[PDB]
UniProtKB/Swiss-Prot annotation:
Localization annotation: Cytoplasm; Golgi apparatus membrane
WD repeat windows: 9-50, 51-90, 93-134, 135-174, 185-224, 229-268, 271-302
GO molecular function ontology, one term from the record: structural molecule activity
Protein name, as recorded: Putative coatomer subunit alpha
Keyword terms of this UniProt record: Cytoplasm, ER-Golgi transport, Golgi apparatus, Membrane, Phosphoprotein, Protein transport, Repeat, Transport, WD repeat
GO biological process: endoplasmic reticulum to Golgi vesicle-mediated transport; intra-Golgi vesicle-mediated transport; intracellular protein transport; retrograde vesicle-mediated transport, Golgi to endoplasmic reticulum
Major subcellular site: cytoplasm
Role, per record: The coatomer is a cytosolic protein complex that binds to dilysine motifs and reversibly associates with Golgi non-clathrin-coated vesicles, which further mediate biosynthetic protein transport from the ER, via the Golgi up to the trans Golgi network. Coatomer complex is required for budding from Golgi membranes, and is essential for the retrograde Golgi-to-ER transport of dilysine-tagged proteins.
Cellular component GO terms held in the UniProt record: COPI vesicle coat; cytoplasm; Golgi apparatus; Golgi membrane
Covered range of the whole protein: 1 to 327 of 1207
Assembly and oligomerization: Oligomeric complex that consists of at least the alpha, beta, beta', gamma, delta, epsilon and zeta subunits.
Amino acid sequence: MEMLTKFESRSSRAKGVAFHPTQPWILTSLHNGRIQLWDYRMGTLLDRFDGHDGPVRGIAFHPTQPLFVSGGDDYKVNVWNYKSRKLLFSLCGHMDYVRVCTFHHEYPWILSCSDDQTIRIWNWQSRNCIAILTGHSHYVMCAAFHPSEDLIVSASLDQTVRVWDISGLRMKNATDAIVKFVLEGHDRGVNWCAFHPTLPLILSAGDDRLVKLWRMTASKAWEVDTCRGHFNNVSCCLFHPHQELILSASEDKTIRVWDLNRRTAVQTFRRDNDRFWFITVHPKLNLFAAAHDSGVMVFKLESAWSH
């Protein structure tokens, strides 16, 4: 496959990137504490948001509301309105770095996870923490809401991937969270976990340099296969929403594309000098973004020799 670069931002180290679901924007959250809002069609910096001290790893738009959420090494989960360009409030409660923060697609919830070994669920309408998910015994590096079921997946340096049943919390308001699966397969800490948008699949990746693929039903899960080949920590991994492809990004300075059905290597992209910290895909368009030591890139994936 070939990478068609649409936009590149040169900066100090970038940690997170989020696509707006309908506008041609990305948010980038930087190691230096600042958040940039870029139009990647025009190549223009639309706005800058400074509300954190130290690196900002979590960053996400709300799917429909004019809001985004950011999560920092200062332990704060910040909620912003990008049309008024205001910091609306901070959600405080975590006692160590916030690694990820996202919005739920239907309920008025924000999910965050932290080096304090907890996942928190907050109601952004009430500004209250509505659930603290405990049980991991080391940093929680990633957490994600399932797109259709009342489930959360989380990944921790305790070498486990957890699937949590939050139907109890759903019923009480749009036993609250029960651990459903404790997935055991990784031999070292796990840095990332991801759901597939329409298939019952999970991806996990971590310091063992492995990307593991899992499948599940309501009643059970199974390890399907492993993508092997990265030669340093894997920072991030994701499913291509519309093609039978897996993507991963690593401190070995590569982004790797893998066959979903065979888990064989399809294509590797390298940078001579830059470790990769994060990758994301647009929910609808053939559009990817990657954060690395020198900034952010937005690219299209094409089959080799197709243009």
